[PDB]
Paper text:
We have re-determined the structure of the PAS domain from the hERG channel at a higher resolution (1.96 Å). Like in the original crystal structure, the first 25 residues are not defined in the high resolution electron-density maps. Strikingly, both structures show a hollow space in the region where other PAS domains bind small molecules. The polar face is mainly formed by chemical groups from the proteińs main-chain, including the carbonyls from C64, T65 and A79; this face also includes the side-chain from H70, which is positioned at the mouth of the cavity, and the mildly polar thiol group from C66. The hydrophobic face is lined by apolar side-chains from I82, I96, F98, V110, L127 and F129. In hERG two domains pack almost face-to-face through their β-sheets. While the mEAG PAS construct does not include any of the N-terminal residues present in dELK, in the hERG construct the whole of the N-terminus (amino acids 1 to 25) is present but these residues are disordered in the crystal lattice.
The KCNH family of voltage gated potassium channels includes the EAG (ether-a-go-go) channels, the ERG (eag related gene) channels and the ELK (eag like K+) channels; these channels have roles in cardiac repolarization, neuronal excitability, cell differentiation and tumor growth. A defining characteristic of KCNH channels is their large N- and C-terminal cytoplasmic regions. The N-terminus typically includes a Per-Arnt-Sim (PAS) domain, while the C-terminal region includes a domain that strongly resembles cyclic nucleotide binding domains, but which has been shown to have little affinity for cyclic nucleotides. As already stated, the role of PAS domains in KCNH channels is unknown; it is not known if these domains bind small ligands or mediate interactions between the channel and other proteins.
Author numbering: 26 to 135
The structure:
Amino acid sequence: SRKFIIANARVENCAVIYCNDGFCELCGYSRAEVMQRPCTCDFLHGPRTQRRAAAQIAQALLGAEERKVEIAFYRKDGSCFLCLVDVVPVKNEDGAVIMFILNFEVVMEK
């Protein structure tokens, strides 16, 4: 099951403007909760979440850079999962970034 969100690159906090069912089911947060949150998805952060990984994802968004970052995330129920976050900038003809697609894959459980 694919898990992904789409972020608005033209607002300061890169707000989530779409999230698919797979993503919501993965992390245990409903679409209503996820929508309009910064697409870094800090609400998934917990004890094992590496500062360096979080920083690297944030960097990719700032610099509109395509990048895969593997990071420990937490579902609503507290379970930890190692997640490969795939940051994909989508630019127009001019070269401006219009949105980001972020894909999430579970690497392994806990």
